[PDB]
């Protein structure tokens, strides 16, 4: 198996379906990456997450730095041991949570911040981020960038973008300086530029000049609304190299995913299926449902009557309703498993429909049913 | 509150209803005692057992001797701390499980036996049994007797009975020798004599001459069938003192209980509700049901449609079916809670119907419905 090989098997308009081959396994694209945590009794088992169809999971570098720390994870054998997951793992850079969760100092050098847990001091930079992602042992490494809060002025958007591109070169060089990392992992760069077309083009040109294994679209899913997100994708994705994966970070709802694949995105991550499952919300082909609703108390149908997941083969809405209303952790576990599996089945229908040249029809059929809400 | 005061509030034929007042609480009679264990995550919580209506629980001295030992329980504060149960506790003597589970030596002195767990040596006798029950701190203490295996010859029945009566006097004197025990606990004697009327009368006369706070009918529920058990109760219970409680050890099924109250029994214990709940069997007014049966998979009714228990207010047969079939421990916990509560509701209907002078009608109505099995 190679370090990183992206092959496009079929196209329909801007949509693509194919595979990323890595040493730890094959990733089918378009791909949804669930957000991983430590393998403990409070989370789904990794064998359960794999059985839902996930080919790769995501780790948050910022949270792993704060607890238990990347040095400790490295001593435990790396993130694959820590998470009980032997297939590919993508790590984000840590920078987005720095802006939104932590911040002592900020400059072109990097950032110093305090842990929201215990007040300890931590530092991130292109060089430090790549080194920490090396300690975590991840397979896909994200360049460290600077996020611009939403909404952003044209000036703050241009300056964060230009800093992100200098930091993207520094991330590239840091990654290349460690043979063990450069020969075994892959590195993605992140396009910035907010809603501004010339800034997005500037960013894409800089990233393609540096050269990366894949290209992420950053700066979206931060409050802008789906219509504006789609308009930005309309011109932004064609600016990225066609023969490399396109990754939309932090997206999103099922209809966000469908519309983004229509616009050339190959990879997605979101906490939404897990967060919804813990809050008693299930995704279905007829839209999301709130299982606590009284109308489900005697509903013998599964959460979704077409879903193939292990939960829907066995459990009725009525019984999941009973568990959730009682506060039984089993209820949240079943809804979370179903939601992650539903997302993987959405990706599979997307892949199959592109392969057969009927994805445009699938997207229209999907929206008509998802928004009618005849659950 | 007194040490031990039995008051009969109402009678119907041989049936009685009333109260036993003890220092740790009031016991409503006829009473069902669930069999207790240590308060851990593997068992129902003691607050759950109390909420089902139980006024008193039973501890098995033999099992407590083997693990963790009565000395350890005493150091932990006694059985009330160990079991998380601050109301009355009855302990059996240990002797029945010696015959049926353990046996190095046996004589008029007592018995020596080996633990089926670790092979260690233990000793029981009237004096040792009463002392161990003192270490356990129980409120109702059972005299130590000799069980005769079923079926028993007239000779083996007479010799075990006569030994049990000499041991009953020794139990009385041992109990009286410890002021802390004699002033705060109560002591029951056990009638033996197998199916033989003259031996039962001999036994009763000996026990009444010694004098006890209550009188148990031993030697039944060991394979004899309900008809023979009832015939023995017919002549055996009237031999015991009328103004003291009558305790039928190890009984039993709901119809056993009803028929025994018709024959003058005031107290019962059985592992049946707990064993059934762990094996997916629920007691109902229409007879027991096997919840794994396919006919319950979409049955939205509770386990029993008249049962007041917390489980039946919330959970359907369908959902308990789902839990049991999945092997989820919650399923066994819910069925066990329901079964113990059903037993307490049976005792309450028995008490109310005796009070109102309609118990004979209740028993006939109960049998007609319980054995029709229109569940
Ligand atoms: O996403 S997982 O497979 C489930 C749990 O969070 C970890 O074992 C990683
Ligand atoms: O991830 S760590 O172990 C925690 C801290 O930021 C450094 O020690 C690196
Ligand atoms: O019967 S109990 O109340 C439940 C458990 O066995 C112990 O706490 C005693
Ligand atoms: O119950 S015990 O502690 C165990 C053994 O039978 C003696 O030590 C009395
Ligand atoms: Zn499902
Ligand atoms: Zn019930």
CATH number of the domain where residue B362 is located: 3.20.20.105
Q: Among positive and negative, which fits the CA dihedral B310, B312, B314, B318?
A: positive
- The H or E element that residue B257 is part of is helix B254-261
Q: Please report whether residue B306 resides in a domain.
A: no
Task: Give the three-state DSSP class for A356.
Answer: coil
Total length of chain A: 375
By Cβ distance, the residue of A298, A328, A330 closest to B300 is A298
Residue A188 CB partners (closer than 8 Å, separation 6+) = A140, A141, A142, A143, A212, A213, A214, A215, A216, A245, A247
Does B116 reside within a domain? yes
Is the separation of the CB atoms in A32 and A269 below 8 Å? yes
Cβ of B316 within 8 Å of Cβ of A314? The answer is no
CA dist., res. B324 & res. B294, Å (int): 12
Asked if A320 contacts A331 with a C-beta cutoff of 8 angstroms, the reply is yes
Burial class (CB in 10 A: 0-12, 13-18, 19+), A115: middle
Please give the sequence-ordered ranges of beta strands (E in DSSP) within chain A, or none if there are none: 5-12, 15-22, 25-29, 31-33, 57-59, 89-91, 105-106, 111-114, 121-124, 140-142, 186-191, 214-217, 246-248, 267-269, 281-282, 289-290
End-to-end CA distance of chain A: 44
Question: If you ran DSSP here, which 8-state letter would residue B223 be given?
Answer: S
The radius of gyration computed from the CA coordinates of chain B, to the nearest angstrom, equals 20
Whether B14 maps to a domain, the answer reads yes
- Give φ, ψ of A186 to 5 degrees: -130, 160
Give yes or no for B300 touching A (CB within 8 A): yes
Instruction: Report the distance separating Cα A275 and Cα A73, nearest Å.
Output: 25
Cβ atoms B142, B216 nearer than 8 A: yes
Q: Choosing from A256, A266, A269, A299, which is the catalytic residue?
A: A269
DSSP-derived secondary structure letter, A194 = T
Say whether residue B314 is in contact with chain A using an 8 A CB cutoff.
yes
B310 to chain A, any CB pair closer than 8 A? The answer is: no
Strands of A214-335, DSSP E: 214-217, 246-248, 267-269, 281-282, 289-290
Q: How far is B313 from chain A (nearest CA, A)?
A: 12
Domain span holding position B172: 4-276+339-372
- Cα three-residue angle A134-A137-A143, rounded to 5 degrees: 45
Whether B73 maps to a domain, the answer reads yes
A295–chain B nearest CA distance, Å: 14
User: Which site among B300, B301, B310, B337 would you substitute to test the A interface, given the most A Cβ atoms closer than 10 Å to its Cβ?
Assistant: B300
Q: State both tokens at A148.
A: 């611009």
Q: What does the buried/exposed string (b/e) look like for B264-294 if buried means 16 or more CB atoms within 10 Å of the residue's CB?
A: bbbbbbbebbbebbbebbbbbbbebbebeee
> Is position A333 within any domain?
no
Distance B263 CA to ligand 3 centre (A): 30
Q: Which residue has the tokens 């080996």?
A: B114
A322 neighbourhood in chain B, CB within 8 Å: 314-316, 319
Token couple for A234: 């309309």
B292 close to B318: Cβ distance less than 8 angstroms: no
- How many structural domains compose chain A? 1
d(CA A21, CA A71): 28
Q: Does A310 touch chain B (CB under 8 A)?
A: no
Q: Taking CB atoms and an 8 Å limit, are B326 and A316 in contact across chains?
A: no
Inter-chain touch A318–B316, beta carbons under 8 Å: yes
Assigned domain for A313 exists: no
Secondary structure letter of residue A113 according to DSSP = E
Task: Let me know if residue A8 belongs to a domain.
Answer: yes
Residue B251: φ, ψ to 5°: -110, 130
Strands B111-114 and B105-106 come out as antiparallel
Query: Does the beta carbon of B294 lie under 8 angstroms from any beta carbon of chain A?
Result: no
**Alpha-carbon distance A69 to A284, whole Å?**
37
Nearest CB partner across the interface for A314, out of B300, B316, B322: B322
Sheet with A25-29: list strands edge to edge.
A5-12, A15-22, A25-29
The last residues before gaps in chain A (C-N over 2.5 Å) are 102
Q: What are the tokens at B188?
A: 């029951």
Q: What is the resolution of this structure in A?
A: 1.8
From ligand 3's centre to the CA of B46, what distance in Å?
5
Helices then strands (H, E): number in chain B?
A: 16, 16
Cα(A213) to centroid of ligand 2, in Å?
Answer: 26
Is the backbone of residue A283 left (phi > 0), alpha (psi -120 to 50) or beta?
beta
Write a three-state SS string for B258-297: HHHHCCCCCEEECCHHHHHHHCCEECCCCCCEECCCHHHC
B98 lines ligand 4 (CB under 6 A): no
Active site annotation includes A269: yes
Q: Is the Cα torsion angle B121, B89, B269, B335 positive or negative in sign?
A: negative
The number of residues making up chain B comes to 375
């Amino acid at each position: 198996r190679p370090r990183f090989s992206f092959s496009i098997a079929a196209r329909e308009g801007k949509a693509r379906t194919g595979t990323i081959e890595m040493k730890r396994g094959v990733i089918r694209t378009p791909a949804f990456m669930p957000v991983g945590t430590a393998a403990t009794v409070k989370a789904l088992k990794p064998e359960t997450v794999r059985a839902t169809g996930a080919d790769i999971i995501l780790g948050n570098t910022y949270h792993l730095m704060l607890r238990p720390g990347a040095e400790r994870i490295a001593k435990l054998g790396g993130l694959h041991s820590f998470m009980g997951w032997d297939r590919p793992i993508l790590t984000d850079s840590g920078g987005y949570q720095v802006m939104s969760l932590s911040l002592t100092k900020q400059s072109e050098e990097g950032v110093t911040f305090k842990s929201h847990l215990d007040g300890s001091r931590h530092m991130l930079s292109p060089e430090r981020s790549i080194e920490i992602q090396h300690l975590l042992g991840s397979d896909i490494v994200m360049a460290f960038d600077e996020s611009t809060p939403y909404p952003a002025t044209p000036s703050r958007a241009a300056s964060s973008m230009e800093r992100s591109m200098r930091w993207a070169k520094r991330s590239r060089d840091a990654f290349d300086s460690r043979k063990e990392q450069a020969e075994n992992a892959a590195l993605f760069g992140i396009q910035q530029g907010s809603v501004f077309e010339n800034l997005r083009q500037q960013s894409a040109d800089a990233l393609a000049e540096i050269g990366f294994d894949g290209y992420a679209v950053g700066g979206l899913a931060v409050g802008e609304g789906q219509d504006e997100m789609f308009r930005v994708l309309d011109f932004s994705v064609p600016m990225l190299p066609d023969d490399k994966p396109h990754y939309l970070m932090g997206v999103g709802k099922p209809d966000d995913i469908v519309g983004a694949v229509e616009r050339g995105i190959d990879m997605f991550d979101s906490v939404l299926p897990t967060r919804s499952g813990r809050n008693g919300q299930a995704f279905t082909w007829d839209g999301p449902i709130n299982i606590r609703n009284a109308r489900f108390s005697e509903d013998l149908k599964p959460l979704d009557s077409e879903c193939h997941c292990a939960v829907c083969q066995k459990w009725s809405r009525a019984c999941i309703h009973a568990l959730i209303r009682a506060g039984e952790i089993l209820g949240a576990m079943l809804m979370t498993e179903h939601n992650i599996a539903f997302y993987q089945q959405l990706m599979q229908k997307i892949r199959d429909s592109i392969s057969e040249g009927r994805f445009s029809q699938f997207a229209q059929d999907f929206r008509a049913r998802y928004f009618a809400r005849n659950s």
